[PDB]
């Protein structure tokens, strides 16, 4: 009657299985949006400063 294992295992699989699939992929128009996300999250951007203050 104690379902804590679900809450723990969710974080466990999110941390581990995704890391494993990233490792597997490594062993094997997106640039514009990537740079756009980078320029929001940049420290020099005022929007980035406001966003980190809010978070």
From Swiss-Prot:
Family, as annotated: Belongs to the potassium channel family. Calcium-activated (TC 1.A.1.3) subfamily. KCa1.1/KCNMA1 sub-subfamily.
PTM annotation: Phosphorylated. Phosphorylation by kinases such as PKA and/or PKG. In smooth muscles, phosphorylation affects its activity. Palmitoylation by ZDHHC22 and ZDHHC23 within the intracellular linker between the S0 and S1 transmembrane domains regulates localization to the plasma membrane. Depalmitoylated by LYPLA1 and LYPLAL1, leading to retard exit from the trans-Golgi network.
Note: The protein was initially thought to contain two functionally distinct parts: The core channel (from the N-terminus to the S9 segment) that mediates the channel activity, and the cytoplasmic tail (from the S9 segment to the C-terminus) that mediates the calcium sensing. The situation is however more complex, since the core channel also contains binding sites for Ca(2+) and Mg(2+).
Name of this chain's protein: Calcium-activated potassium channel subunit alpha-1
Subcellular location: Cell membrane
Function: Potassium channel activated by both membrane depolarization or increase in cytosolic Ca(2+) that mediates export of K(+). It is also activated by the concentration of cytosolic Mg(2+). Its activation dampens the excitatory events that elevate the cytosolic Ca(2+) concentration and/or depolarize the cell membrane. It therefore contributes to repolarization of the membrane potential.
Quaternary structure note: Homotetramer; which constitutes the calcium-activated potassium channel. Interacts with RAB11B. Interacts with beta subunits KCNMB1, KCNMB2, KCNMB3 and KCNMB4. Interacts with gamma subunits LRRC26, LRRC38, LRRC52 and LRRC55. Beta and gamma subunits are accessory, and modulate its activity.
Annotated transmembrane regions: 4-24
Disulfide cysteine pairs (residue numbers): none
Tissues expressed in: Widely expressed. Except in myocytes, it is almost ubiquitously expressed.
Domains: entry comment: The S0 segment is essential for the modulation by the accessory beta subunits KCNMB1, KCNMB2, KCNMB3 and KCNMB4. The S4 segment, which is characterized by a series of positively charged amino acids at every third position, is part of the voltage-sensor.
Disease connection: Paroxysmal non-kinesigenic dyskinesia 3 with or without generalized epilepsy: An autosomal dominant neurologic disorder characterized by absence seizures, generalized tonic-clonic seizures, paroxysmal nonkinesigenic dyskinesia and involuntary dystonic or choreiform movements. Onset is usually in childhood. Patients may have seizures only, dyskinesia only, or both. Epilepsy, idiopathic generalized 16: An autosomal dominant form of idiopathic generalized epilepsy, a disorder characterized by recurring generalized seizures in the absence of detectable brain lesions and/or metabolic abnormalities. Generalized seizures arise diffusely and simultaneously from both hemispheres of the brain. Seizure types include juvenile myoclonic seizures, absence seizures, and generalized tonic-clonic seizures. EIG16 is characterized by onset of seizures soon after birth or in the first years of life.
Species name: Homo sapiens
């Amino acid at each position: 009657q104690r379902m804590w294992w679900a809450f723990l295992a969710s974080s466990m699989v999110t941390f581990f299985g995704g890391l494993f699939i990233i490792l597997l992929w490594r062993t094997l128009w997106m640039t514009s949006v990537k740079d756009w996300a980078g320029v929001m999250i940049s420290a020099q951007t005022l929007t980035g400063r406001v966003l980190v203050v809010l978070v």
